[PDB]
């Protein structure tokens, strides 16, 4: 999540609508996010993951001149590409549907999340279509096509709450920032239609049925049972080893006697 960045050229909120995502002097390094051990529900687990990402930011990236709009990795549950307009290309309400549907990954360009040494992916409901494939990494490019639609600002198109109308056109603009200054990184994509922010939600990448997030990843229920596999009960001192087991009593690799799920 881009530990190092150069100082900003301008502190003011942006006024141009993207036209090319660029973070000068962006250096990216892998982290080790860790939530405290304990029995949690999924909402609070995602909250702890987000707080841990914030802490990983505060540890070195905050002091290293990061614009605070460059928090690369975030765990969310919103369906960002919802209540948009096919013509306007932006979400009509001006905000996002604050309803949780399934855990989601939001990544800035150059950012990634790595589940290859953790079964927390099974807790998020994100699984690889090929669970035996070596390495399960969700990079920014793996989310291509899952661009988060930008937010239609109410101030620009203010006919919705004016002069007894709700329909207006060609004044449509996206929120280039928020109320508290910080930007949304709203840009024009390569197919420069309506502007969309460069966040590449995994939900939207999966929902578009073409490829990548469907042919590599899998959207399943979050399955908060911990994702634990099978448990092997063994009685080396009263059972002859099953066929294919060697008699290894004075060790932890005893012949498995009873098979059972966790």
């Amino acid at each position: 999540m881009m530990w190092k960045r150069d100082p900003p050229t301008s502190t003011a909120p942006p006024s141009a609508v993207g036209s090319g995502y660029s973070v000068p002097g962006a250096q990216y390094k892998w982290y080790d996010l860790t939530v405290p051990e304990g029995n949690y529900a999924l909402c609070e687990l995602i909250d702890l993951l987000n707080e841990g990402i914030v802490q990983l930011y505060l540890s070195e990236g905050r002091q290293n001149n990061v614009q605070k709009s460059d928090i690369g990795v975030k765990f969310d549950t919103r369906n960002f590409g919802l209540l948009r307009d096919p013509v306007t290309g932006l979400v009509t309400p001006g905000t996002y549907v604050y309803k949780g549907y399934h855990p989601d990954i939001v990544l800035l360009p150059g950012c990634a999340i790595d589940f290859t040494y953790s079964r927390l992916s099974l807790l998020l409901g994100i699984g690889k279509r090929e669970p035996y494939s070596k390495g399960f990494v969700i990079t920014y490019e793996d989310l291509q096509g899952g661009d988060i639609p930008a937010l239609l600002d109410l101030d620009s198109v203010d006919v919705n709450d004016a002069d007894g109308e709700v329909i207006e056109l060609d004044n449509a603009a996206p929120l280039l920032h928020d109320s508290a200054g910080v930007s949304y990184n709203v840009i024009y994509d390569q197919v420069t239609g309506k502007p969309v922010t460069a966040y590449r939600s995994w939900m939207l990448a999966y929902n578009v049925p073409n490829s990548q997030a469907n042919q590599t990843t899998l959207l399943t229920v979050p399955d908060m049972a911990g994702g634990i596999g099978a448990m092997y009960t063994s009685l080396p001192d009263t059972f002859i080893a099953p066929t294919g087991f060697k008699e290894d009593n004075t060790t932890n690799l005893c012949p498995v006697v009873g098979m059972n799920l966790f």
């Binding site: 080893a241 060697k246 008699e247 290894d248 009593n249 004075t250």
Partner: protein
Amino acid sequence: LYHDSGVCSGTLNSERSGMNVVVELPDRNTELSYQYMLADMMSRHHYFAL
């Protein structure tokens, strides 16, 4: 050597008959048994470094 410990004992066994054929009981004294045997076979003032 972990003698007379049933929880951390050794294992000598064959391959075709993989059954462990060494059983160590916590209520026996292997080291003192060796002490008494060795003292009976010969006097203890001899210093055998091996």
